[PDB]
Amino acid sequence: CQFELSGADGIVRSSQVEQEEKTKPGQAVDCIWTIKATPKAKIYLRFLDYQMEHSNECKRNFVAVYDGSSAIENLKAKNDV
Amino acid sequence: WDPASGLNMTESQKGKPANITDSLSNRSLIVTTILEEPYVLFKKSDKPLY
Numbered sequence A: 001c002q003f004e005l006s007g008a009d010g011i012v013r014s015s016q017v018e019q020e021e022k023t024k025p026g027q028a029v030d031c032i033w034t035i036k037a038t039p040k041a042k043i044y045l046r047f048l049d050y051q052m053e054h055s056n057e058c059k060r061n062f063v064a065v066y067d068g069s070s071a072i073e074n075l076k077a078k079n080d081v
Numbered sequence B: 001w002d003p004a005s006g007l008n009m010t011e012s013q014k015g016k017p018a019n020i021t022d023s024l025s026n027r028s029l030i031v032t033t034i035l036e037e038p039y040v041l042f043k044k045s046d047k048p049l050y
């Protein structure tokens, strides 16, 4: 479940999965989002709406941010960033 | 014990078992609570608070 989303500005649509890769709701679902800035541009993110009511804990459900390139190397965080 | 495996012992698996599990409320009460708003609350931040 990997999609491209780059440019100068934009928004990652929440649970935007019934159009990209229509996954049935029953199974656990997870997806990653790839950002690319304008040449010579570090990026700042701001969350406009965040509510993971499925559980306070994340052994099932969570949202995280990765810096650098997309590896397990360095969790930026799992507030704005 | 042998060079190939150094982690073999009859009593390695069990350590100080004493009483099975724990007695009910031996060290911690069993307090119940309903989610009423200006009485109990989920903390503001979420992620470093599990």
Ligand SMILES: *[C@@H]1O[C@H](CO)[C@@H](O)[C@H](O)[C@H]1NC(C)=O
Binding pocket: B007, B008, B009, B010, B012, B013
């Ligand atoms: C050690 O090896 C023996 C023989 O396979 C096994 O029965 C025993 O459970 C093992 N114990 C540990 C600590 O690995």
